[PDB]
């Protein structure tokens, strides 16, 4: 039983699950065992050995295969009846439009990143379908329901962004280990992956902190570890010493020579090796990486993945070599892996608890009792009132929300003479405001179009400063994302004295 009226909706209602990881797997299992027969499952990744301690629908023999696919297959083994449709794809793909989402009576998120969760939040608001948002981290977890016009949305109260760093110190004055790691990850892209002006590895000779007066080379040398080494740990560090201003209060960097370096418990990864060892790791990882890149064809680019040994070896070694250069203690591969990949500890038990609460909230939703739904926090220790699981009532929509409000409007402060259309497109509209395919136009006479969703349309305006279009203090911009059916009015405030390494800022943010 459920009873009738409930078991009915559960039996015919089509339900969507985004993500097939810790929560996803347990969710499918609980959905199926509770009575759900029509389930869509989407995930963009393949199974990995580290998934095996908590994603029970996957086994060692499934490694390398699609999470969504194998998940569907495993479930059918103890419930052959199940009507499951699996998608090995990103939920951000334009194919999953509002019409797609509107097909479901319930959507349940089981993701691990802000970008996709914000997108899903908007798709569900647009299709007006109930959305259960959930997350876990170590022993903690939470579950909440999101319903348009009734509760707050995922973005009604954004979460604190991750500590970002200025391309100045990462290139000229690193002080913390995390700085070297960031440097190593930039270095990876510059060499084997996508190139980005903000990820330059060479010493920035444009840093105001000290008065003044890569991909090409690397590939030409055939990715010679020795050549690459010398340039990044000898030449550049020495060329950095040119800016005498930089050092005079702190221990300056000490260059490293390939030949000189070569002349000198717990888990193996938890051990900190010596300089020579990390130089050998550097050389080794490059040899492997360059082969992978070559086997993908010309013009091919590699995408850094925390789970790839070589990719992780490169970052580990490059990072520790820079750390040493700056008199810092090096760190184990185990620790660098956590920082570089922003790895969140995970166990089966926490995910099982959350997936179970998720289905309980869904039953109330499909039962017409969304007013009995709530946010549930799973803590590690009982609170003063003896509660390990703390249920809190849902809050009504926040009129200040820049996403679910009737007429979204934000005011951005920036230098209209220094910010390009590309920065506006990538760092502000896409990254900051989480839009996937934006269409931005100026609110003027002819309705000037700055950015188009259609590939190859506004490619020319990309390097042009905003002012070149007549954008100035008081200007208003309308940003649209037709996929998310989201429209944001952007008020511009021209400011020249923003601050060090600050391209823009949202009036109101903390």
């Amino acid at each position: 039983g459920l009873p009738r009226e409930l078991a009915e909706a559960v039996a015919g209602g089509r339900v969507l699950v985004v993500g097939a990881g810790g929560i996803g797997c347990e969710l499918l299992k609980n959905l199926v065992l509770t009575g759900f027969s029509h389930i869509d499952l989407i995930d963009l990744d393949t199974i990995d050995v580290s998934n095996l301690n908590r994603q029970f629908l996957f086994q060692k023999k499934h490694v390398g295969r699609s999470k969504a696919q194998v998940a569907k297959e495993s479930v059918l083994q103890f419930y052959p009846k199940a009507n499951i449709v699996a998608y090995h794809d990103s939920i951000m793909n334009p194919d999953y439009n509002v019409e797609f989402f509107r097909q479901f009576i319930l959507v349940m998120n089981a993701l691990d990143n802000r970008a996709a969760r914000n997108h899903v939040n908007r798709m569900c608001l647009a299709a007006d379908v109930p959305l259960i948002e959930s997350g876990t981290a170590g022993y903690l977890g939470q579950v909440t329901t999101i319903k348009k016009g009734v509760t707050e949305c995922y973005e009604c109260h954004p979460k604190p962004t991750q500590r970002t760093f200025p391309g100045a110190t990462i290139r000229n004055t690193p002080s913390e280990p995390i700085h070297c790691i960031v440097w190593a990850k930039y270095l990876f892209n510059q060499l084997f992956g996508e190139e980005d002006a903000d990820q330059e590895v060479s010493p920035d000779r444009a840093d105001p902190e000290a008065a003044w007066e890569t991909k090409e080379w690397a590939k030409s040398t055939g990715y010679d570890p020795v050549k690459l080494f010398t340039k990044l740990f000898k030449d550049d560090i020495r060329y950095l010493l040119t800016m005498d201003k930089l050092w005079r209060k702190r221990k300056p960097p000490v260059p490293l020579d390939w030949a000189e370096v070569q002349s000198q418990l717990g888990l193996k990864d938890q051990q900190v090796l010596d300089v020579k060892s990390y130089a050998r790791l550097f050389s080794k990882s490059i040899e492997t990486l360059r082969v992978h890149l070559a086997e993908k064809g010309d013009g091919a680019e590699l995408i850094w993945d925390k789970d790839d040994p070589s990719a992780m070896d490169f970052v580990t070694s490059a990072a520790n070599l820079r750390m040493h250069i700056f008199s810092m203690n090096m760190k184990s591969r185990f620790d660098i892996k956590s920082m570089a990949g922003n790895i969140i500890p995970a166990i089966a038990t926490t995910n099982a608890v959350i997936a179970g609460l998720i289905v309980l909230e869904g039953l109330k939703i499909l039962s017409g009792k969304i007013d009995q739904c709530r946010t549930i926090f799973l803590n590690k220790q009982p609170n003063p009132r003896k509660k390990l699981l703390v249920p809190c009532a849902l809050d009504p929509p926040n009129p200040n929300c820049y996403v679910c409000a009737s007429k979204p409007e934000v005011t951005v402060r920036l230098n209209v003479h220094k910010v390009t259309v590309l920065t506006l497109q990538d760092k502000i509209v896409k990254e900051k405001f989480a839009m996937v395919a934006p269409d931005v136009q100026i609110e003027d006479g002819k309705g000037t179009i700055l950015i188009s969703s259609e590939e190859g349309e506004t490619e020319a305006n990309n390097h042009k400063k905003l002012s070149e279009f007549g954008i100035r203090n008081g200007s208003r911009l309308q940003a649209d994302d037709f996929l998310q059916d989201y429209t944001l009015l952007i008020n511009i405030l021209h400011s020249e004295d923003l601050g060090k390494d600050v391209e823009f800022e949202v009036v109101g943010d903390a």
Binding site: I343, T349, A352
Partner: protein, 313 residues
């Protein structure tokens, strides 16, 4: 010394409780009785966790309308022994674990049977068996756990004896601590006449008394309330409520007559919750890391409440 494959496999949890804690888990053998809904979850959690070995004990056979409700048992097993019907899928969850099966009634096992396990988790057992296995475990320094699910409710209980563990609360300093649990017999027989008890009673979740009622129902009837005999079972449950609460000097009203509607059958979501908390406590106890809940855990799926109560002392 764990292998390369295990390091890769447990990476995400080793980053959580450390390698040493994982090692103590790799040397622990657990006994689980009752491979129904709750038991199935706990089995999966511990096997994925990477215990040394796990012995699934159940003498009951898979009855009609049961396979498609137990993810460890294939739809084609109506009639086989639950434990054996679960072995294959359970073992595949982790080849590093020694998953064994036992088909004998738990109430006929000699104390020597329990001395091969570091922890014992009971499911679907009567009050007498729970008390019995707890007493046996105490004499042998065996960690004891019990839990069950009833409709939207669920509960777990632990008796770790004199349990010492390491808690990291600050570089991070690992402080050694010690908690003392009491016998399940004392936890199930609390005197509410005492002044100190009269004060605690008003802060105690009614789920404790709902547990008393269901335990007593499981004793008068070798079964738990069933949806097939709902009208009939509800009638008895209400009568048992009045007897139990009355024999404790507590008003029978403390438990709304409406409770009978929410404590029927085994709901998959509830098995997942209670099974996750129970397995979590077992891993904690075995790894001797982090403070274990002392000593009862009560879950109400209708309200979203997860409460920890200390009863018995």
């Amino acid at each position: 010394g764990i292998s390369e494959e295990e390091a890769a496999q447990y990476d995400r949890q080793i980053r959580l409780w450390g390698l040493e804690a994982q090692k103590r888990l790799r040397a622990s053998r657990v006994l689980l009785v009752g491979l129904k809904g709750l038991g199935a979850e706990i089995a999966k959690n511990l096997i994925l966790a990477g215990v040394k070995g796990l012995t699934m004990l159940d003498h009951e056979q898979v009855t009609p309308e049961d396979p498609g409700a137990q993810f460890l048992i294939r739809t084609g097993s109506v009639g086989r022994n639950r434990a054996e019907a679960s072995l294959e899928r359970a073992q595949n969850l982790n080849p590093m674990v020694d998953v064994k099966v036992d088909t004998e009634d738990i109430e006929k096992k000699p104390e020597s049977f329990f001395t091969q396990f570091d922890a014992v988790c009971l499911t679907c057992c009567s009050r007498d068996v729970i008390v019995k296995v707890d007493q046996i475990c105490h004499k042998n320094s065996i960690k004891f756990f019990t839990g069950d699910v009833f409709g939207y409710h669920g509960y777990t209980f632990a008796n770790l004896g004199e349990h010492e563990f390491v808690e990291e609360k600050t570089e991070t300093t690992m402080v050694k601590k010690k908690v003392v649990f009491c016998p399940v017999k004392e936890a199930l027989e609390v005197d509410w006449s005492s002044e100190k008890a009269k004060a605690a009673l008003k802060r105690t979740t009614s789920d404790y008394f709902l547990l008393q009622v269901l335990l007593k129902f499981r004793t008068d009837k070798g079964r738990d309330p069933s949806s097939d005999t709902y009208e009939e079972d509800s009638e008895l449950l209400l009568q048992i409520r009045n007897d139990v609460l009355d024999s404790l000097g507590i008003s029978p009203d403390l438990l709304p007559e409406d409770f009978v509607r929410y404590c029927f059958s085994e709901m998959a979501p509830v098995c997942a919750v209670v099974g996750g908390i129970l397995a979590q406590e077992i891993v904690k106890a075995l790894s001797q890391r982090d403070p274990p809940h002392n000593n009862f855990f009560f879950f109400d799926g209708m309200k979203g409440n997860g409460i920890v109560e200390c009863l018995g002392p």
